[PDB]
Design a protein around this ligand. Sequence first.
Ligand code: NAP
Ligand code: NAP
Ligand code: ADE
Ligand code: ADE
Lengths: 198, 178
Amino acid sequence: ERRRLGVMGGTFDPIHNGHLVAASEVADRFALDEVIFVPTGQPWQKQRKVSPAEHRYLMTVIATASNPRFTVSRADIDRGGATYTVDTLTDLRTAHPDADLYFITGADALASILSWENWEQLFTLAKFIGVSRPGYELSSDHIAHAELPPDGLSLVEVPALAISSTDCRIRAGQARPIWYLVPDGVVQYVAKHRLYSG
Amino acid sequence: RRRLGVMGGTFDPIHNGHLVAASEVADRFALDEVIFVPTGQPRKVSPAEHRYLMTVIATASNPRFTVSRADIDRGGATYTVDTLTDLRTAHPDADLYFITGADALASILSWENWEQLFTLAKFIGVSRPGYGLSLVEVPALAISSTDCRIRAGQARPIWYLVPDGVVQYVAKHRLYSG
Ligand SMILES: NC(=O)c1ccc[n+]([C@@H]2O[C@H](COP(=O)([O-])OP(=O)(O)OC[C@H]3O[C@@H](n4cnc5c(N)ncnc54)[C@H](OP(=O)(O)O)[C@@H]3O)[C@@H](O)[C@H]2O)c1
Ligand SMILES: NC(=O)c1ccc[n+]([C@@H]2O[C@H](COP(=O)([O-])OP(=O)(O)OC[C@H]3O[C@@H](n4cnc5c(N)ncnc54)[C@H](OP(=O)(O)O)[C@@H]3O)[C@@H](O)[C@H]2O)c1
Ligand SMILES: Nc1ncnc2[nH]cnc12
Ligand SMILES: Nc1ncnc2[nH]cnc12
């Protein structure tokens, strides 16, 4: 029986309960033995100043610590240059050569992955799961510009992804509470390091 | 004057969406405290003691949240005019703000003694996005107690939907499984 590993890729600025719900749901639905959270090292620059990678890594560790089936990888953080998912999966394939990999991320990010990165490598390395919030309307036809390999892509709606990291950052900047949006431990970490209150 | 939130609901189970909503309303309306009030109840509803205890577990860590037994101890059906009359007596010099799901509050004119309701408190309805009385949209209310019960019954996880402590409470008392 091959091990089945989720690879949960995100910038996580901050990680929030929506991400955790999504990973837990996908792990159960796809019978995953473990979910490996991989915070981005250097996410693509958007028109936005991302917290230092070490802060995002620690928040992800804090958030996932209590789950026996979650862990955190530094694979992207400890690779120089912009983060690309072919590289993420090559590294994890190396560290887990006998495992079946399932890469999990937001539906919108998965569209970007498929539009820029090489499909031959991507679908040789893993299957893909796109998770989306209520009201987000994307078809599997629209997530790619062409037909995808057989069982290569699944899409999963997760109601708790109504919670967004952007909303958490704005609230923190406005000195509005992020209790219950964001895990205990992470709330206090955000505040004492003043990550968004600047 | 002191400003008190009154967070009314059946809470079967209480979940992180409820906690998010109460936290936002308390901040937005500068409430000194939010009192959670589990509804009295006779669709098989979990016994009132279990719903009360889950709500206590869920709110314990917040210095400004507490839980009242006023509805479950009254006996018989819950009417909010009774809830507010009880709390008005318990806190005679407080401005009350009654908070619950906007879908519930939509029928307030059909609730018992609506005339007295609007003299006793201000009303705040919290809703998920896409939705006298103020309305507050709360993205986290995409999480619903119905979804939590369905999952638990199907032996699917409710981690992170429901607070720590409440997850394990639900399972060890087999509330929805079976
Ligand atoms: N165009 C790109 O940015 C791009 C290109 C190639 C590869 N990737 C990979 O795509 C993944 C996401 O990168 P990002 O987080 O930087 O994209 P993002 O553009 O910051 O976020 C895009 C959307 O996806 C959601 N999201 C991101 N990761 C998620 C996750 N693990 N679970 C659920 N929802 C998630 C975000 O919600 P929140 O804000 O709530 O997370 C947001 O709504 C990373 O592994 C990254 O290496 C991204
Ligand atoms: N005659 C009356 O005076 C009268 C009549 C009806 C209701 N009420 C009062 O209305 C309140 C709701 O009763 P219910 O909970 O039994 O209604 P419900 O019909 O069980 O649920 C109605 C909707 O409201 C949501 N909800 C309930 N309480 C909430 C809260 N505190 N914050 C956010 N969403 C909430 C539910 O989501 P979840 O399932 O996720 O909570 C559901 O979507 C109680 O205080 C009840 O006494 C009074
Ligand atoms: N899935 C899980 N199993 C056990 N303990 C947990 N704590 C948080 N998530 C958990
Ligand atoms: N709003 C809050 N203030 C202080 N400690 C808390 N713990 C959980 N919620 C809290």
